[PDB]
Curated annotation (Swiss-Prot):
The chain holds residues 2054 to 2166 of 2168 of the full protein. Expressed at varying levels in several tissues, whereas a smaller transcript was expressed specifically in testis. Regulatory subunit of the ATP-dependent BRF-1 and BRF-5 ISWI chromatin remodeling complexes, which form ordered nucleosome arrays on chromatin and facilitate access to DNA during DNA-templated processes such as DNA replication, transcription, and repair. Both complexes regulate the spacing of nucleosomes along the chromatin and have the ability to slide mononucleosomes to the center of a DNA template. The BRF-1 ISWI chromatin remodeling complex has a lower ATP hydrolysis rate than the BRF-5 ISWI chromatin remodeling complex. Belongs to the WAL family. It comes from the Eukaryota. Residues 9-113 form the Bromo domain. It comes from Homo sapiens (Human). This is Bromodomain adjacent to zinc finger domain protein 2B.
Amino acid sequence: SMSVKKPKRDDSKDLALCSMILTEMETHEDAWPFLLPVNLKLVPGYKKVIKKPMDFSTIREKLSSGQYPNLETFALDVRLVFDNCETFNEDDSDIGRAGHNMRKYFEKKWTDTFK
């Protein structure tokens, strides 16, 4: 509350560390469905159904331009990518399995880097 604060967690490395995680997600062999925005002209149903499209290149540009106010807003966009994938793709598809795998990979890096 006013003039009452918990001890200050050092957040000075968060930007660098989120960038490193994102590099590791970019270079994973199962990243291919997520590297670029889904083409809304060429994929029937996507525009109407997926209310907030998100992809790694869009996260990278937001990251690079100071559009994440803190590390939690960064995690929310990463998770959005996988939540969108589960909304549109069957679990038993190459893209559906890709999404589950990447989400796992991300959540471990996130815990190991920050928790």
